[PDB]
Amino acid sequence: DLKLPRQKVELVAPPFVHAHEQATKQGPKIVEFKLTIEEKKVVIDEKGTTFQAMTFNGSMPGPLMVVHEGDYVETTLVNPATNTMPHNIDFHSATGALGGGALTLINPGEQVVLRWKATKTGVFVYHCAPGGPMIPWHVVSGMNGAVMVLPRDGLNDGKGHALKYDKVYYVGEQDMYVPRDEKGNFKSYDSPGEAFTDTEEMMKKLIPSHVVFNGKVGALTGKNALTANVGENVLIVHSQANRDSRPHLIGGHGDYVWETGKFGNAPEVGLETWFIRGGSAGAAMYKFMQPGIYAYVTHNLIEAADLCATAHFKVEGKWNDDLMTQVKAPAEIP
Amino acid sequence: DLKLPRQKVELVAPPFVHAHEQATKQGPKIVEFKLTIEEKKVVIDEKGTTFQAMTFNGSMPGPLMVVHEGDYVETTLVNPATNTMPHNIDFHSATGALGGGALTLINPGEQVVLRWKATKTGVFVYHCAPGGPMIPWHVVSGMNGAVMVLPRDGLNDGKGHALKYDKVYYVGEQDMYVPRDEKGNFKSYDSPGEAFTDTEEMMKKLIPSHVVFNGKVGALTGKNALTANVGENVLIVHSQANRDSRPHLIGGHGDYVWETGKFGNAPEVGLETWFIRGGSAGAAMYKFMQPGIYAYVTHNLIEAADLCATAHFKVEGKWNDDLMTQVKAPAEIP
Amino acid sequence: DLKLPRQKVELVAPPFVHAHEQATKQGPKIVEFKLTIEEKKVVIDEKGTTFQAMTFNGSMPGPLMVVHEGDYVETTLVNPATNTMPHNIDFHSATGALGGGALTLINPGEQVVLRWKATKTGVFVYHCAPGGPMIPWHVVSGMNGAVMVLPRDGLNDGKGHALKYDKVYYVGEQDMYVPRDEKGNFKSYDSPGEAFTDTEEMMKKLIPSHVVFNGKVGALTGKNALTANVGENVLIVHSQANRDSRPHLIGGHGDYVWETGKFGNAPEVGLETWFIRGGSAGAAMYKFMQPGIYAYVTHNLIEAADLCATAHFKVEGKWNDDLMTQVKAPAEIP
Numbered sequence A, B, C: 001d002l003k004l005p006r007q008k009v010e011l012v013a014p015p016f017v018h019a020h021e022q023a024t025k026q027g028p029k030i031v032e033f034k035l036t037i038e039e040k041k042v043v044i045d046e047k048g049t050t051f052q053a054m055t056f057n058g059s060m061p062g063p064l065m066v067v068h069e070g071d072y073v074e075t076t077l078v079n080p081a082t083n084t085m086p087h088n089i090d091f092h093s094a095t096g097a098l099g100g101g102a103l104t105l106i107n108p109g110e111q112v113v114l115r116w117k118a119t120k121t122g123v124f125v126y127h128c129a130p131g132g133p134m135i136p137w138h139v140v141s142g143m144n145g146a147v148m149v150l151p152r153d154g155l156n157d158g159k160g161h162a163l164k165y166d167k168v169y170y171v172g173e174q175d176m177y178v179p180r181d182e183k184g185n186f187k188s189y190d191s192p193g194e195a196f197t198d199t200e201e202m203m204k205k206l207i208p209s210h211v212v213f214n215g216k217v218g219a220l221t222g223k224n225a226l227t228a229n230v231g232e233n234v235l236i237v238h239s240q241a242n243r244d245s246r247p248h249l250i251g252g253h254g255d256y257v258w259e260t261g262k263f264g265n266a267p268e269v270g271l272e273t274w275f276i277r278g279g280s281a282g283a284a285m286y287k288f289m290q291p292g293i294y295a296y297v298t299h300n301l302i303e304a305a306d307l308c309a310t311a312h313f314k315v316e317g318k319w320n321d322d323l324m325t326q327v328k329a330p331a332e333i334p
């Protein structure tokens, strides 16, 4: 019926993003992705707290899918028989059937193939939504990711100038709700199913126990720090599927920021901190001007410092004293 | 003194909106509204929880008032003798006297008439504000609604194109604070007055027990689902008088969105989720492309699924397979 | 090395702002500021609750620093020997070294001098950030202020028209976390150090006990009410270093509002309520049209009325009946 070229995509684990063109002269294609659901218990903090996670492709967040405006996205979703729950998928980028949720419901042992057309550009959340109280449960359990729909001519500043990024990272923020016991220790559970009751009581009080980038406290620090060099223009995509976030690059700015995350609107310029609406993704580009460590955080500093929400960037290059200088090092007050 | 034609308006109960023109060739008029305050106990959930509500015109939210830029809005507010508290009204659309609160204070048995000029276009909250700690109390009790001030030429996209809506619905989101007892059951009270102490202790902890559209869990589902047909351009006005919200049309987008809700600013385009600042209203227009059920939610999915915050839309028309198709129905994993 | 004129600035205590030009024909200068850190116990409410505060220059927020685009800001930070903790400073307006935090760490008895170039216009937060869990602690303790970086040609509406303000006030909103005892009374502590453990447990639950403008409940009411006259264009700068706020001028509007607070973006017009992202500052200008009291609030009315977050404005001039009139004073219902 639909007579167009097919392109397969190997998805990569966040914060990386599969190779793709920014501007392109290709026409619309059918872009094929596979997602496999994995239920598993995982360690979310350095003190060893465990969590019944549910993931697309074994990661939190799910991998980022990149396509251009007009492409058709054909997704195979697989719920292996080792999973215990029905799952589905809804794309905020898609039109109809609750974003696809209503066509994609699959029990363990099943798979489904869905095609939707990419009519709107920007970055959009995808997430599981099986029904009723299960919706919030699967999402705060890790079943959310994002999809970026680029314009064929690539990004622009709204004033006719191309904005080309040299690299792109995907940062998925996850609010997690782990209940404590009488003594105030986090509880461990055998199955997602048994975690459900206690997790649900706690979720309704709306205060997360952990807020983490990429699935774990510290995931994007040390050896897994994001990297750049002075002069590189870096795009950061940030999703939050349930609760608002306020990302900030410490030492840096957002040179161009789509805080609503939709590229038919012109980016704002020069931001210190931006706002990601719960249930959405946004994008911010910055050209690094100085080397050293930067921290990428949500500027609820309690969340940042105390609940897990910090990534590091490690940037190489030449210090610029014109931009910033220590005039006089610490010293006794005269 | 003010020599202009008078127009009376029969207000309708949300989510409907009284008949009005979008663009108009009439000159400024004095538009006359009546609001009567009702204190009453009401059922807010399907398990029968009750709540001491205080309302304009017996509904939550108050009815939506529509007028054009330059009109004079003349409002009669009535506090019948069967009410037990003084009430007033403040319009965010109005200039001076705490938005009118300071001229509109009335005890049970009294009424007052206020006129203000509509100098600013957009959608704006109105709410009771009697004074001190009473302000938050009356608002989270239901005494808030909205008023839409259209431009005489109707809405535009910012790029010179008219945006005409075929219908408009008003969705009022209410954060409610109902205290539990020692056993963890919601408490019932005889009077608003007696609910005050317990409600106040709980309010200060800032976590609502229920978040509802149009006064009740389920109010805008089943028989009272919002409706449209494929091809209709629908405007949704959303108010939140105290706490932020993040509305999302599941299966749909915001084609044009005034998230700050003021029509002197150009709408943003193509949104997945938008943000209604506490103490404000916003507006989003969407042309339906596909039939079926859509859910309108705040994309805090805990609030949506677990605390009451979901409306349904039921849309008639022809499925479009080009936009979205089930390629392969659920099936055993090969 | 850097061969330019030096200008000293005497900082003033908020909500006032040191004298400065809006548009200017001066070239880039080195602008020199001194900040001295003060740890002290202070009264934050009318019932006499005390709080271990940490401040720049003995106030909450820190004073507002004003400079123009291209200036070099040279800041002497002093940590006197009567303080018990190391402190530093990070500017969101600055580029590199965690906004300066990584060059400015000083123990009691020390001082440091830092210079950064003002490449981006807008209003930006500055705050202490010593490291780890200490970051949120020092900030919610009062160690945050703001810096405004004006364009040399002054502010504009985005459509080529100058916007000149007749006065400017700086409103710093502080979320504070004071723990209660078993009986439910606020606790007093001898030292910042001893407050730390209890404050930290409470901070992680993310619900502040007090939200105050300018350091105290009632600080900007009564004798210290902000003032204006009908016809004055007033700029209000609002910072929030950790948690979001939704400012609203009751009786008024935001005629021009930079909600993200960066002047390379055009202001929005006609707002009822705007949003200050946690970790940022914004600015709103309003021309007063009517006399009387206005309240400036965050339109979480619980925060406003119940947790400390209200300022008053007292405006002189002639009432305008065309804008708003009491047609009929309170009276018995016929």
Ligand SMILES: OC[C@H]1O[C@@](CO)(O[C@H]2O[C@H](CO)[C@@H](O)[C@H](O)[C@H]2O)[C@@H](O)[C@@H]1O
Residues within 6 Å of the ligand: A182
């Ligand atoms: O030591 C018993 C005493 O402790 C409480 C705590 O309030 O409950 C604990 O002990 C129960 C019975 O031994 C456990 O089942 C319960 O789960 C645990 O919290 C009281 O119930 C009891 O009187």
Ligand SMILES: OC[C@H]1O[C@@](CO)(O[C@H]2O[C@H](CO)[C@@H](O)[C@H](O)[C@H]2O)[C@@H](O)[C@@H]1O
Residues within 6 Å of the ligand: B182
């Ligand atoms: O069974 C009595 C025991 O229960 C507590 C709960 O901590 O209080 C309950 O009983 C009181 C006196 O019977 C009631 O007035 C009170 O309101 C109820 O919670 C204890 O106070 C008491 O020791």
Ligand SMILES: OC[C@H]1O[C@@](CO)(O[C@H]2O[C@H](CO)[C@@H](O)[C@H](O)[C@H]2O)[C@@H](O)[C@@H]1O
Residues within 6 Å of the ligand: C182
């Ligand atoms: O009256 C003693 C009784 O009260 C509790 C409250 O649960 O604790 C109080 O008394 C303790 C010992 O007297 C204090 O150290 C404690 O800090 C205070 O809360 C119980 O522990 C105790 O059984």
Ligand SMILES: O=N[O-]
Residues within 6 Å of the ligand: A180, A181, A182, A183
């Ligand atoms: O200790 N369990 O609730």
Ligand SMILES: O=N[O-]
Residues within 6 Å of the ligand: B180, B181, B182, B183
């Ligand atoms: O059970 N009443 O608090």
Ligand SMILES: O=N[O-]
Residues within 6 Å of the ligand: C180, C181, C182, C183
């Ligand atoms: O009463 N002190 O926790």
Ligand SMILES: [Cu+2]
Residues within 6 Å of the ligand: A054, A086, A087, A088, A128, A129, A130, A138, A143
């Ligand atoms: Cu799932």
Ligand SMILES: [Cu+2]
Residues within 6 Å of the ligand: A090, A092, A125, A127, A279, B248, B299
């Ligand atoms: Cu969603």
Ligand SMILES: [Cu+2]
Residues within 6 Å of the ligand: B054, B086, B087, B088, B128, B129, B130, B138, B143
């Ligand atoms: Cu009232």
Ligand SMILES: [Cu+2]
Residues within 6 Å of the ligand: B090, B092, B125, B127, B279, C248, C299
């Ligand atoms: Cu209000």
Ligand SMILES: [Cu+2]
Residues within 6 Å of the ligand: C054, C086, C087, C088, C128, C129, C130, C138, C143
């Ligand atoms: Cu400090």
Ligand SMILES: [Cu+2]
Residues within 6 Å of the ligand: A248, A299, C090, C092, C125, C127, C279
């Ligand atoms: Cu910061």
